[PDB]
Every structure is written in C-alpha cells, then in structure tokens.
Design a protein around this ligand. Structure first.
Ligand code: NOL
Ligand code: NOL
Lengths: 306, 306
C-alpha cells in the first residue's frame, strides 16, 4: 500500500533524446524514425527573442547550420521545416531505439511524465498535470527546452508536451508535438498573462478515494450534497465545476470503496469550508489535484508496461 | 526555475529487471552480469511466512525450481546461494544491458529513486528517503518485492535498496543489495516496531534554501539563533539534532543565497513555533524533509547523466 506521485519509467524516452545546436543556442530534441523535433526558437539569437519573424529567420538557415548530436554521434541533417512552433529536422539515420509512439494533444486536468533534459542528456523525471489555464508547474532551467512530457500505454509512448518557455510566475508553457501551444501563449519574450488557474475538482475527489483506499478516512462525514449544491461551493473556492461525466469516471472508485460520489463531494465541501485543522491526508496538508482518477486506479492495481 | 520532487531516469535500471518465480510465489529480481538478486522469501509458501527457517527451506530447493524470466526469455539457473536476506541466482547468461554499477549501503536522511515493478516489468518511478527509523514511505503492492532503489552518478548506478515487506503502518522495509535490512527488521510475518520517526532537520533547511532560490521567501525573518538554542527547539519538535557537519554541507547553499545557516535556523524555529498560517512554501503546506542538500544543489544546477 501507500500512495506516491509517480512517473512512468523513462527508458523508452531516454533513447530518443538528442542535443540540437544552431548558432550559439543549444537545446534538446526528440529523435524518432528519421526526424528530430525541437522548439523552433533554437534558431533565435538572444536579441531575436523579443520579436522574432520566424519565417525570415528560418530562411537564413540551411541544413548544415543545425548540429544534431545523439550521445557522441553526429547525425547528418538533409531536410528542415517549420510546423507551427516546432522545427522538424530530417536526418539520414533512423533512430534504432524508436519506441512505438503516438503524438496526442491532451486536455486540461490530465497528467503526464516529464523527463527534464540538458544538452540532450536526461536529468530527472517527475509527474504533473496540464493545469486548467494550460500551464504546467514544473522544474526547468536554461537548456531544458525540448524536454518532452509523455504517457505510456503498455508499449506505446504517447508524447504530449514539448517545453518551450517559462512565464514570469515560474510556471511553464509549451506545445504538443505538432507545435501548437497549449493555452494562448506565443513563443516570444513578451509579457503574457497565464490567466486564473482553477483546481481540478475531479482529480481531488479521485485522490480522496486514494486516501480512503490507503487508510486515511478522517475527512469522511455523515452528510451528503447535490451536484448543484456542491458546484455552488466549488465556485467560491476556485474549483472546476463537477459534471455527470466526472461522476461516471469516478464510478469505479465509487464501487471499490462503497462510497457514493456525492457523499464524497460533501466531505470535500466541509474540507473547503473548514480547512485541514493542521491535519494531513496521505501526508499532505493541502488538497492535491494532480492525480487523475486513472492515476489512482492504476496505482492501486499495479499496471505495468514495456 | 521551479522545484519538483524528481527521480533519476530509470532506463539503466529497467534493463535489469526480471521476473523470479519459485513454486507459487513470483516477485522481481535484479539481473547484473550473470547473477540475479531477489528477496530470499520467494522460497516461502504463504504458511512459511509466519516463522521460516530459511536454511531448511532453501535446502529443499534446487536450481530448476527457480524460473527466471527476462522479458520473454528464460534464463538457465546453474547456482543458487543465500547472502543474508537475499538470494543470488547464478545464470548461464550475462545481462548484455548491465550498467556500470555499485552496491552501497546508504545512511538515514539520504534520498534515492524507486522503480516499482510487478512480474519483472517496471510500473512507475518515484523519489524518496531512508527515514531516521530506517523505513521508507513508498507505494508497494503485492508482487512489488524485489524492486530496487538507486542513485545515478553520471554513468554509474549505485543500488542501495531492495524492497521486502510492508509493516502495519503502510511503511516499507527492505535490505541493501548484500541482503542486510535497514533497521532492526527481520523478514518474517510477525509484528515489528518501526520506532519513533524523526524529521531530517538538515534536509528541511536545504529545502528552505531551494525555496529562497525559487522566490518563496516569506518565512525569512529578522532573527538569528545558536546551534544549541535551535537544537533545543528541534527536540520538542521531533527534529534531528543539527551538527556542525550539517552546517558545512549546507554551506554552498549558504553562499549562493547569502543567508547564514543559523539565520535560516531561526526562520525554521519560528515556523516550528508558529506554524504555516495556512500558507505554503514551494506549494506545500508542510515542512518537506526528503530533499538532501545535494538534491537541492543539483536540481538548480542541471546535472545530467548517462
Ligand atoms: C529553453 O532552454 C528555455 C527554458 C527556460 C529557461 C529557464 N527556464 C525555462 O523554462 N526557454 C527560454 O529561455 C525561452 C527562449 C525564448 C522563448 C521564445 C522566444 C525565443 C526564445 N524564454 C523563456 O523561457 C522566457 N519566457 C518569457 O520571456 O515569456 C514572456 C515574458 C517576457 C517578459 C516578462 C514576462 C514574460 C524566460 C527566459 O523569461 C523569464 C526571464 C520571464 C523566465
Ligand atoms: C512482496 O511482493 C510483498 C510486498 C508487500 C505486499 C503488499 N505491500 C508490500 O509491501 N511482501 C510481502 O508480502 C511480505 C512477504 C513475507 C515477508 C517476509 C517473510 C516471508 C514473506 N510480507 C509483508 O509485506 C507483510 N509484512 C509483515 O507481515 O510484517 C510484520 C507484521 C506482521 C503482522 C502484523 C504486523 C506486522 C505484509 C503482507 O503484512 C501486512 C498485512 C501487515 C501488510
């Protein structure tokens, strides 16, 4: 038993990480089949960042201005193109370690694993969620750009995030693997509003179920509530409105613990109106919202991969 | 910027994980060179668990009663021996994916990465610490036994933990890779006292430095204290006594942030005497003690591996 915030094993992704250099800028790229993916702002100088014309900037570059290094090995670039905010470098060598992969665009509230990378070498791995305002709260230093987020379905790697830039909040923004930003962000060094972040109500309920499943049950009360009543408390409190779909996705945890979702909503309501009283749930003094219901199900089912 | 609880990339360890079966018991093993390591209690039936004579039980077994499966592939066992509480299965095939590795026995307060495994296939990865009472608070279901903890030094894998059993606390116990338990635990299904757990004072201070480095500085005060004065507050509060060595290891974070360790101790003291007032530090409403000072240094330095 026990419950930890847990990332997918990153082996399948480590084999895809390469170093990409263009001029005096180095960052990470994703090497799959015979294509290298990376943020297009690798083509920018530190002055270009304030207002780049990427088309014009890309025109001044040729294949040989792009150094791709996979470990020690130099790949030869033979085609380059710009898809949205990513740059796709065609190389002469397919990656012998290409996993079975997909590119997905995830939804706010879903979770994924980040492998943070510098100079093409993996640094660490951690788990997180696409916030409702389409930011992620991660850990990214200079040179982490091009690090990717992913989920694993048995053998198949679903890539969903590529890191591009930190906002003035210490929150991070980026794109899917077709180069479209999550959220309204553009890749330019100009002030940008992240927007009001809300809490992922369904994820919090799934966590409370993970708590019950792991012995923590003090928050459990004699009350119930209605979907509309609870939603009315959800909104004084920043919470995502709870829908019937949310209720259904919480259904399996419902039946395992024998606790109705709306009874659980009542306990959450009391927590939101009465706080923690200096107590903890699964060793946190806060309400945690970065476990999807599926993260909960599989953590106490033992789903494996590879 | 930002600060997450971050695990080493597990690729080097995924390639070492195999399935070990003996009778009607299956668990994970660590395959390195031509040896497979696993908990010796794989040789036990569900009745044996209450009071096993491991010597006598091991005598009834022969090499062919041990099925080792590396992915799909059956290894042939040709020698078996018992070292403390681990069992070492000599196989006819060296693991072509053996990393450069070491076996270390870590100290209370140090951190490591766990790759949780079922039937020899990795499930997830998370970070944690050997508690002062020599327990770890992880996430382990039935069949997770044989999962290992590790740190990575550039290319070299330092194995330090092998999971054996959960206590009645939802805390976990296990051995180094020579088979000696951390703590006073034995591998038997008998009630065992974990013992009073204390907080890793030096780790908490290192975190407060990580906080300052990442913008969170409200806890910072106009006071200072003495090593003995603070230690006197450390003990009403469960904290490990702070030593001069602790002070020195915190020295580099000292100089980066320009804040004396004993000034930081005063802020921690006020936190311990006055609580959080419903506020947060790096997004936690609790004082976090599972980052060593070295975890902090490298997270905001960007150390890579492979
Ligand atoms: C790639 O390695 C990095 C990763 C950053 C660096 C440290 N932490 C990270 O997450 N990405 C960058 O450095 C990019 C580079 C430019 C981005 C697109 C345009 C051309 C290249 N920039 C940022 O990450 C900046 N974000 C940013 O400026 O956003 C808009 C803005 C501007 C001014 C005030 C507020 C907001 C970073 C460097 O800016 C901060 C200084 C605010 C972090
Ligand atoms: C190996 O896959 C598992 C991993 C466990 C299972 C679920 N979570 C885990 O961490 N390990 C075990 O199942 C071992 C098996 C025996 C251990 C040594 C003797 C022979 C094999 N046992 C345990 O993990 C038990 N721990 C335990 O009993 O500790 C002493 C004790 C006894 C009675 C009351 C309190 C404490 C588990 C199964 O016991 C609990 C039911 C308390 C979890």
């Amino acid at each position: 038993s026990g419950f930890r915030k847990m990332a997918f094993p990153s082996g399948k992704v480590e084999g895809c990480m390469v170093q990409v250099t263009c001029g005096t800028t180095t960052l990470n790229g994703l090497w799959l089949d015979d294509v290298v993916y990376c943020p297009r702002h690798v083509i920018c100088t530190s002055e270009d960042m304030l207002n780049p014309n990427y088309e014009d900037l890309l025109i001044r570059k040729s294949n040989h201005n792009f150094l791709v290094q996979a470990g020690n090995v130099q790949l030869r670039v033979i085609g380059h193109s710009m898809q949205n905010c990513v740059l796709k470098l065609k190389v002469d060598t397919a990656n012998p370690k290409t996993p079975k992969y997909k590119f997905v665009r995830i939804q706010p509230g879903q979770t994924f694993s980040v492998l943070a990378c510098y100079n093409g070498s993996p640094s660490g791995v951690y788990q997180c969620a696409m916030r409702p305002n389409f930011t992620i709260k991660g850990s990214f230093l200079n040179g982490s750009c091009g690090s990717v987020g992913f989920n694993i379905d048995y053998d198949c790697v679903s890539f969903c995030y590529m890191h591009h830039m930190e906002l003035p909040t210490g929150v991070h923004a980026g794109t899917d693997l077709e180069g479209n930003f999550y959220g309204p962000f553009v890749d330019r060094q100009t002030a940008q509003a992240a927007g009001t972040d809300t809490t992922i109500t369904v994820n919090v309920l799934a966590w409370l179920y993970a708590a019950v499943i792991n012995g923590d049950r003090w928050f459990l009360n004699r009350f119930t509530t209605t979907l509309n009543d609870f939603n009315l408390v959800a909104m004084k409190y920043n919470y995502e409105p709870l829908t019937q779909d949310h209720v259904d996705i919480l259904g399996p945890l419902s039946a395992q613990t024998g606790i109705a979702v709306l009874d659980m909503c009542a306990s959450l309501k009391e927590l939101l109106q009465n706080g923690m009283n200096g107590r903890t749930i699964l060793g946190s003094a806060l309400l945690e919202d970065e476990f999807t219901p599926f993260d909960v199900v599989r953590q106490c089912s033992g789903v494996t991969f590879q």
